[PDB]
């Protein structure tokens, strides 16, 4: 109901497993994030031709070894949000200290 | 252009604008956004089915037009009132339109979705600061409950003991 | 013949010129209009003052501060939840 | 019913200090620390100067200006990172830069209100054919005080443009209250 | 407010002279700015010159009948005596 | 209001001390309020001194 709701902000939207399955082999899911300190949870950044448009959606999942043979099977790039600059960043901080 | 008193017109009086007619400048520019707002809701939401543009149109343009009301006598507690409330829905357009965005206005990319600030949102930032510019004083007896750091220096032992009171002090002692 | 190369004396009349500056009439009434307008923003504040110096922290933030600290750490029991705080 | 010729105008409570003796009004900085007037002035009348910096900041602050609110309280934070979380040395060169560059921008407006004496000229020009072709000198330090506003100016300027009469001005913009919403600001 | 007339004759002659190019001499009291053959918008910048010189706000309303020299440093002269209040 | 703003400029703390008179006539009935202590206590309460 897009046409129905008011517009508020951009939450995240939290999917399950199978969601996420079906967009990732339908071709939809741009790029993956993998975080939580158990690494069980998932920002997945969508593409422009799914339907909806790009959205950062939120995944939960159990442990099951078979998330890289379908993501980089299909199109999807892992990524994560600390780059060199953010590391850069840091070493900065700890020479400060 | 003829709004306010009456209009002359490069002949006698040229500078009517600015007699003071009893109400307040931003009279018909509030009741003209008002009038636009609720035209563009109404026709937005008839040509693309999202009913954010007619809930967010007519809703405002409505207190809008009962703030105009309110500020055709800008000398009262009602045009006080009437000049408060049409900054405040301005300020909330504002605000949603740079904050949150509106919802057919929704695209594909990230990039492409951009709440920004077009042009609804700059005319409401505009009356808004008319609204500053021209007068918003008036009802300054409501603001926050006054400190007991600014009844220190106060000669009044009975208010400065008061403020003591309500802010939980109470019995400490005065001693003066 | 030029000793003037590797110029210390220049580096060091930046610090002369900054040491200058100041100590003279104009600085005074400098200092003299800055303790006016700092007189006048504190008749003008009186509230957000002691509302910053006394309430924000002791009264405001730290309270709230010390009750969501206990709920997340304390385990989900009545007393650690309710009696005991 | 005791209706005084002219309509009763309530004269409410002023919202703003009123501006120091020492200003200027045309943007222009003000001096250091003496207005320059007071030499010619007599002595021992020139104790308002001192008496408008008392009544000015200690004695008859208006009420609208010791007004509690959110903005007010996020405000107390700048004022005092400029008076006592900046070094005065810093706020020293600072105010240099800020004189320097409001003498620039009061030489900016300065020629700019003498070009529109220029405008105002051939505005009268046009719209009264070729007889008059002065300009007022009033409406010129009117422009340079900011005592004008915009509609004001546009209102002058088709006047001129469509019937002449170069001494017929606008009323004089009253000065802008403070704003108040409440506990917000 | 008892403001010395002379002194602000004086300086109001030394500016007129300086800005337009004549002499202190010159510059005299009854003197019209017309005989000196200062433009509509060169007695502007003289008022201007004035209100910068003296640091006051010059009456709007009678800028456009000040004649002479003496007629200038008479509303300058008030100016001052009315500043303080 | 030299010395307050001597006061808020910091100045005071380093300025050569000095002695000021202040005479208030003898009219007010016994000790209702001494009006040169008051002055002095609003200046010192005023400057937070
Ligand atoms: C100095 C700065 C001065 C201000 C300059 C801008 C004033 C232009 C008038 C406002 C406008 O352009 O705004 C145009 C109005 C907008 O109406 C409002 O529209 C809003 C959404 O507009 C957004 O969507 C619109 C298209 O749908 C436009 O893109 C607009 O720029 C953008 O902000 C609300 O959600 C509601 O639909 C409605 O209240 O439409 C209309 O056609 C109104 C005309 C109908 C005739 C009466
Ligand atoms: C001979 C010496 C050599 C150097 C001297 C001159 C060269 C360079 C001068 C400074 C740099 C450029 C300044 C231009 C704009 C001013 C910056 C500013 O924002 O404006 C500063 C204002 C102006 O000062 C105060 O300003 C007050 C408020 O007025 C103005 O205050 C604001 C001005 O920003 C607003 O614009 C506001 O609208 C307007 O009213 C008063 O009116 C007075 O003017 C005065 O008390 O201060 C404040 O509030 C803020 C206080 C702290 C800000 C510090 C900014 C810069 C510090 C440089 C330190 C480096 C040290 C090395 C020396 C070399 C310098 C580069
Ligand atoms: C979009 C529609 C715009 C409608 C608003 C202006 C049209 C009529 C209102 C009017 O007469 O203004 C009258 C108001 C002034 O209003 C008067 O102001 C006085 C000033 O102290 C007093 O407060 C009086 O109480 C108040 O009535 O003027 C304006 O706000 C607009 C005048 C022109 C400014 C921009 C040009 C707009 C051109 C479009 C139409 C002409
Ligand atoms: C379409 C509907 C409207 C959409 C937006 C259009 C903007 C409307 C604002 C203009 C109204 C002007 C007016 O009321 O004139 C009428 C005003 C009324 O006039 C003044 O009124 C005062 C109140 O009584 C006093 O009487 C003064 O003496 C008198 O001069 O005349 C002026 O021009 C004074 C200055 C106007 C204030 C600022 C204009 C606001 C727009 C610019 C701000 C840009 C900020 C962007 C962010
Ligand atoms: C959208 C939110 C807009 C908030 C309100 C904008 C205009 C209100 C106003 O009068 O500004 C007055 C403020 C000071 O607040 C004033 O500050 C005063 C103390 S002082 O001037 O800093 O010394 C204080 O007494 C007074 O209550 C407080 O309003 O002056 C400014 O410098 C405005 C800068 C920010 C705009």
Redesign the interface.
């Known amino acids: 109901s897009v046409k129905t709701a008011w517009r508020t902000q951009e939450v995240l939207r939290e999917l399950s497993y199978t969601q996420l399955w079906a967009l990732v082999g339908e071709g939809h899911v741009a790029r993956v994030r993998f975080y939580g300190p158990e690494k069980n949870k998932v920002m997945a950044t969508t593409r422009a031709s799914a339907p909806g448009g790009e959205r950062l959606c939120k995944v939960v999942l159990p442990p099951d070894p078979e998330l890289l043979d379908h993501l980089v099977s299909n199109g999807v790039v892992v990524d994560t949000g600390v780059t060199e600059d953010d590391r850069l960043r840091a070493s900065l901080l700890v020479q400060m200290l | 252009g003829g709004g306010g008193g009456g209009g002359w017109w490069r002949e006698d009086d040229p500078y009517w604008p600015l007699r003071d007619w009893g109400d307040h400048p931003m009279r018909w520019w509030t009741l003209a956004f008002a009038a636009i707002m609720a035209a563009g809701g109404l026709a937005t939401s008839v040509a693309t089915g999202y009913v954010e543009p007619v809930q967010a149109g007519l809703g405002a343009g409505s207190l809008l037009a009962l703030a105009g009301a309110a500020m055709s006598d800008a000398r009262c507690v009602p045009g006080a009132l009437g000049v408060k409330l049409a900054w405040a829905v301005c300020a909330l357009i504002v605000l949603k339109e740079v904050s949150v965005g509106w919802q057919h206005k929704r695209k594909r990319r990230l990039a492409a979705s951009a709440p920004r600030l077009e042009l609804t949102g700059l005319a409401a930032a505009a009356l808004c600061a008319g609204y500053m510019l021209t007068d918003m004083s008036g009802l300054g007896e409501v603001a926050l409950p006054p400190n007991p750091g600014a009844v220190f220096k106060s000669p009044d032992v009975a208010y400065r003991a008061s403020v003591w009171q309500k802010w939980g002090y109470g019995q400490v002692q005065m001693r003066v | 013949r030029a000793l003037l190369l590797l110029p210390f004396s220049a580096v060091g009349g930046a610090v002369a010129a900054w040491q200058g500056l100041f100590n003279s009439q104009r600085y005074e009434n400098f200092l003299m209009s800055e303790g006016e307008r700092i007189w006048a923003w504190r008749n003008r504040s009186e509230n957000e003052r002691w509302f910053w110096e006394v309430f924000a922290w002791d009264r405001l933030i730290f309270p709230i501060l010390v009750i969501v600290a206990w709920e997340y750490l304390v385990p989900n029991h009545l007393v650690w939840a309710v009696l005991a705080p | 019913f005791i209706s005084p010729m002219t309509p009763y105008v309530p004269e409410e409570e002023p919202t703003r200090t009123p501006p120091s003796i020492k200003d200027t009004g045309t943007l222009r900085p003000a001096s250091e620390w003496y207005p320059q007037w007071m030499q010619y002035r007599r002595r021992e009348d020139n104790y308002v100067f001192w008496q408008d910096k008392f009544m000015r900041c200690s004695t008859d602050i208006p009420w609208a200006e010791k007004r509690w609110t959110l903005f007010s309280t996020v405000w107390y934070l700048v004022q005092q990172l400029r008076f006592v979380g900046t070094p005065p040395a810093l706020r020293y060169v600072a105010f240099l830069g800020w004189r320097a560059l409001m003498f620039q921008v009061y030489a900016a407006h300065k020629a700019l209100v003498l070009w529109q004496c220029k405008l105002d000229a051939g505005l009268a020009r046009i719209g009264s054919g070729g007889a008059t072709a002065t300009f007022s000198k009033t409406m010129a330090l009117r422009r340079l005080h900011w005592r004008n506003s915009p509609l004001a100016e546009a209102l002058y300027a088709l006047n001129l443009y469509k019937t002449g009469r170069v001494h017929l001005l606008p009323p004089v913009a009253k000065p802008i209250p403070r704003p108040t919403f409440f506990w917000l600001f | ?4 007339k002379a ?2 004759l004086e ?1 109001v002659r030394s500016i007129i002279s300086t800005q337009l190019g004549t002499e202190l001499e010159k510059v005299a009291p009854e003197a019209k700015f017309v005989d000196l053959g200062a433009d ?2 060169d ?3 003289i ?2 010159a004035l ?8 009456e ?5 009948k ?1 004649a002479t020299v003496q007629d200038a440093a008479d509303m300058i ?1 008030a100016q ?2 009315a ?3 | 209001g030299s010395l307050v703003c001597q006061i808020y400029s910091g100045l005071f703390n380093k300025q050569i001390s000095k002695n000021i008179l202040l005479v208030n006539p003898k009219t007010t009935s016994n000790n209702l309020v001494d009006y040169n202590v008051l002055l002095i206590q609003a200046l010192a309460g005023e400057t937070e001194m």
């Open positions: 407010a008892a403001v010395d002194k602000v300086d509509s918008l007695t502007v910048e008022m201007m209100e910068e010189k003296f640091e006051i706000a010059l709007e309303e009678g800028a456009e000040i002269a001052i005596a500043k303080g209040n």
